[PDB]
């Protein structure tokens, strides 16, 4: 069950085996201030899950919504000084910049010192993104270096 | 306080429907009584990062015919980004401190979108950014259809040929759909299928499409037929299979072809179109070619003058 | 000891934020038993540390071996139900087995499917490692460095 | 049953004294004494993935001479390995068979221990890999050791030119670093002056090995002069202002040598040696490097026969 | 006086059963039994106009082993045929002589029956022409047929990868299309799935031959698994999105094979087979393709000797 934090953010409810990723992909390592990631743990509200508790670290709402796609239903028990104080949802946002790696090799979104950025939107049974640079709209899956 | 003023030319889906009308109003006014001064002093880098005959020249002629002094590169080599290994960024970054506008064209996708991050105040116009877009052909196509065919709505066009890469159609196609009244009929190879990122649209846009593999089929139908050259240099070594012209229009195809219907090719025609047809009535690719001067001129003016012209 | 479980090896004394690899580099993060983390935690030795909580599972051999160059003080606490017993020491075999990112881009053992092996002349210095196919003796520092 | 038999011929820093002298002696005895009716079975292929004149002809020839033939190929030209498509191993898999014996010469190192991983039981022999090793291009001179001074023990060598790259001299401060009372004389620009790690295996006995000034001065102190071509064809751009041997060799400077000291070279030679060197009781690189015959044969045999005497 | 003797070695669809088994049996007997004092006269040249590793070394070697030598050339590099100037025939005219026997490997088909038109009496042997035929790269496996199941009669093979191009499998549904009760299992993209015309000679007896789904399912039904490299180096642009074997082979999918069925390959291999395939009581392509020795020799002899027994 990890423990009990002081002041910082916490992500109650994180899809199993998905807490490692939302961490490894992100520089939630770069951050030195103590982190107790509880990958694979009992849920209670749900059955199984993952619970992050990065202290001293604060995520207003940009790195909040970016989880919509990933962890659909989740929670931010924004505990500030041993006391829980959070009311934020991982809404689907306009477009999540600087993060993903474009599929369209020819697109001009990497080859230059410019950063990347794909527009978020909900298609059908699945989500699909469009790289603003090259107006192309690839599926929310194919957008990786595999 | 002209609309497109200080605005940038990049992707048609960055505008609307009612947005177009403005340059076109500008245009029909010039095809009439012009103004060889209206854009004096002004300097426009006509830097092209890829080959081209009609989109560059015409454009310089659309600039020279208005009074705007220009000095841009034809070949993206004898420039610092060439053998000096300089990134487009810097390249733009600085060129932007010499000219009042950049009218480029670049081999990669959305290299135009690049410019603006290193442009700002300075207007950036694209002569096609990779198979992606070519917002600039759509406009000359725009003058045509509306010119050679009264109204601009309630009609059907037969887009045939390399669609997966035709910067051309994406733009135009996506353009039209926005109008109230324009059915779409796409005729293309198994592979060269019209990118989806345009397909879905019409759908929601109520605009209906359908795929056919004949020229005669929608013969008596389509008010206009848009043919495309095949992005030969723009191809991965797999799609290379369906290389040549799976579709090559001819004469007799014009039997039950509707009167006002014409052939439109943004040129150059590689093998898709015959020369004997140039004599025919529909032959307008050529007339659909000299439009740019007018389209690009109208267009040029706008962005370059807050106040409406004459 | 503390919140410890029954059977499940625990990896202590890890250089600050090195543990993070043990899950992506080692992809150990693909399990359905307990794995409660906590990197950047305070330590009573030198600087900070990182620990991984394993339930129903322990270490192995090549994981006793990779620990070596991985961490000097690495004290894997193999607990047989609340009792730490196999506090084995990170030691790497003399032989090097297919699990390294070599720097001698010359030794064609790069672009052709092979078996990544080196050497390791353990000296009272660093955990360097002489080339196996090129006997060019370098230092894990870089070889292993990013 | 002998030590030097069925031994994978790759490198040399992993064997004991007993071995060389072993075959070395078979060479004093194979100085002029041909035995056809012997290994007239075991077929061999000459696999030249690089370009060296002697070792190739010298080898393929002793292969011929010691009663037999030689298949192989001069280059990775017409081989299913690339054109068709195959890994240096796949080829070996099937290679073990046919030519029970084959020699490998790759422009990349480590490859030996590779082809030698894809054979099974069938014996190999890599006479040079990338620029890291060479077994056969040493012993043949180790012959020239007895040709110039007999006793291989205590002496004073010298290695000019490139010494870090070359797969030839790599066996020097490693095969003798286990001999006796020998004094090492090196000569090569910083990075080339042979790494200290080939020099760190000699820490258990810590005998001779140093580097100072030009040939001009270390000549009246040399008992053995064995230069080495500056591996012009293999290195790194990061250091390109050194295609020249720096320290050359001309009668002009050599007229201060010891008494039995002779001039030897790895071969091929370019500027290292002066054409005016041909005329000297020392210039021995001629016969020096030319032992492959009397040489190679000596070992060619031994690594493919049981309890045999000569 | 025998049937398989002085026979122009080109293709295989024109001979009768009696032939193979003939030499096939000479191979079970040439499994380890060398006879020098025999054809130690008839000189042969290894003429490699292409690039295949085994057949080349494997061949030139048995040429060596069966008491003799091998001239030839690895490529049309230093030959008066091009540089100087000559037709593939002119060369033959003079070629019949010297090397009474020669093997031809052209990157173009039909050429066999050509060189074989410009010899006169002197015997030939084309082990692969363009991508239409191959005599010697079949029998050697027909050996592997007895190695895996003995009896060549009734079975269930399988040929993955490219099957239309390759000059290797071209002899399959043609040499056995005259055998007995055999069941054909093919696997290759449409045009590659072997033409119906090689399949139309089997209309006089109409036995087995079909094509369906992926390897995933036809593995628990195969008695013989013989894939084939996707002739990446020879084809047509008109179909370039298929450089990949489509259907691969990994322990992962193979764990459903019959019982004596083994994994064989034409060679060279790339992706067709997985390196993790090496470890399997089936992965036989190792010895499978490696019969040239025990093999070739068997026929090398027979086509150059009178009334001889072994
Ligand atoms: Zn993109
Ligand atoms: Zn290596």
Curated annotation (Swiss-Prot), chains A, C:
CC annotations in GO: aspartate carbamoyltransferase complex; cytoplasm
Record Gene3D superfamilies: Aspartate carbamoyltransferase regulatory subunit, C-terminal domain (2.30.30.20), Aspartate carbamoyltransferase regulatory subunit, N-terminal domain (3.30.70.140)
Positions annotated to bind Zn(2+): 102, 107, 131, 134
Single Gene Ontology BP annotation: 'de novo' pyrimidine nucleobase biosynthetic process
Similarity comment: family membership: Belongs to the PyrI family.
Domain of life: Bacteria
GO function terms (MF aspect): zinc ion binding
Protein role: Involved in allosteric regulation of aspartate carbamoyltransferase.
Pfam family, one: PyrI
Regions crossing the membrane: none
InterPro entries: Asp_carbamoyltransf_reg_N (IPR020545), Asp_carbamoylTrfase_reg (IPR002801), Asp_carbamoyltrfase_reg_C (IPR020542), Asp_carbatrfase_reg_C_sf (IPR036792), Asp_carbatrfase_reg_N_sf (IPR036793)
Reported cofactor(s): Zn(2+)
Record keywords: Metal-binding, Pyrimidine biosynthesis, Zinc
Subunit: Heterododecamer (2C3:3R2) of six catalytic PyrB chains organized as two trimers (C3), and six regulatory PyrI chains organized as three dimers (R2).
Protein name, UniProt field: Aspartate carbamoyltransferase regulatory chain
Cofactor: how bound: Binds 1 zinc ion per subunit.
From Swiss-Prot, chains B, D, E:
Disulfide bonding pattern of the chain: none
Keywords: Pyrimidine biosynthesis, Transferase
Keyword Transferase: yes
Organism superkingdom: Bacteria
Enzyme Commission (EC) number: 2.1.3.2
Record-linked Pfam families: OTCace (PF00185), OTCace_N (PF02729)
Residues that coordinate or bind carbamoyl phosphate: 54-55, 105, 134, 137, 267-268
Gene Ontology CC annotations of this record: aspartate carbamoyltransferase complex; cytoplasm; cytosol
Chemical reaction(s) catalysed: carbamoyl phosphate + L-aspartate = N-carbamoyl-L-aspartate + phosphate + H(+)
Biochemical pathway: Pyrimidine metabolism; UMP biosynthesis via de novo pathway; (S)-dihydroorotate from bicarbonate: step 2/3
MF terms in GO: amino acid binding; aspartate carbamoyltransferase activity; identical protein binding
Gene Ontology biological-process annotations: 'de novo' pyrimidine nucleobase biosynthetic process; 'de novo' UMP biosynthetic process; glutamine metabolic process; protein homotrimerization
Gene3D superfamilies: Aspartate/ornithine carbamoyltransferase
UniProt cross-references to InterPro entries, sorted A to Z: Asp/Orn_carbamoyltranf_P-bd (IPR006132), Asp/Orn_carbamoylTrfase (IPR006130), Asp/Orn_carbamoylTrfase_sf (IPR036901), Asp_carbamoyltransf (IPR002082), Asp_carbamoyltransf_Asp/Orn-bd (IPR006131)
Binding sites annotated in the UniProt record for L-aspartate: 84, 167, 229
PANTHER family: ASPARTATE CARBAMOYLTRANSFERASE, ORNITHINE CARBAMOYLTRANSFERASE, MITOCHONDRIAL
Oligomer and partners: Heterododecamer (2C3:3R2) of six catalytic PyrB chains organized as two trimers (C3), and six regulatory PyrI chains organized as three dimers (R2).
Function: Catalyzes the condensation of carbamoyl phosphate and aspartate to form carbamoyl aspartate and inorganic phosphate, the committed step in the de novo pyrimidine nucleotide biosynthesis pathway.
Cross-referenced NCBIfam families: asp_carb_tr, PRK00856.1
Stated family: Belongs to the aspartate/ornithine carbamoyltransferase superfamily. ATCase family.
This protein's name: Aspartate carbamoyltransferase catalytic subunit
Source organism (scientific name): Escherichia coli (strain K12)
